[PDB]
Amino acid sequence: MNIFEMLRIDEGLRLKIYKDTEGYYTIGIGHLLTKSPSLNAAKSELDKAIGRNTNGVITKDEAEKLFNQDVDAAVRGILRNAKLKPVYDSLDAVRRAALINMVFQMGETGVAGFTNSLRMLQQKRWDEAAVNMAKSRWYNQTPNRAKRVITTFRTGTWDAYK
Ligand SMILES: [Cl-]
Numbered sequence: 001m002n003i004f005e006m007l008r009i010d011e012g013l014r015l016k017i018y019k020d021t022e023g024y025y026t027i028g029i030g031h032l033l034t035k036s037p038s039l040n041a042a043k044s045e046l047d048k049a050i051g052r053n054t055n056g057v058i059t060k061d062e063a064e065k066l067f068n069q070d071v072d073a074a075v076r077g078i079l080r081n082a083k084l085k086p087v088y089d090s091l092d093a094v095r096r097a098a099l100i101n102m103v104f105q106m107g108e109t110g111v112a113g114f115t116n117s118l119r120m121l122q123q124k125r126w127d128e129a130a131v132n133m134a135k136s137r138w139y140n141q142t143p144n145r146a147k148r149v150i151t152t153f154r155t156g157t158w159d160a161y162k
């Protein structure tokens, strides 16, 4: 297992524009197009992302390409974030993947607001961080996924993904 497989499990793969769990227009493997309510806006952002007139539909290949870019950006975002980088640097390889997952889902910003958890992770207080992370909107809204990511931080293994 790795970050790509892990996220492919959490996000799925859809080749037509769809609404995510928050009702926002997405496509592919969790690639958010726009927070706007307008499908047109969504189609527009999509064509601009792919570089062609898609008409709201993309191929597997195109989805994977967006995916690679998005994972790369998430990593790079962490590494540029003063609150995140240090946490990330302190972790083992499995747990780093958990941290990338969260950033991919919620943005650097949303993640950086888990201040207290982050510190606990940094201190390697696994059980504690897990409990603190569960008291979040994130957990309450997407509980099954959050559970998987949390277990990953708690154990440092991929068991939740097996
Ligand atoms: Cl893009």
Ligand SMILES: [Cl-]
Pocket (backbone or CB within 6 Å): 141, 142, 143, 144, 145, 146
């Ligand atoms: Cl979920």
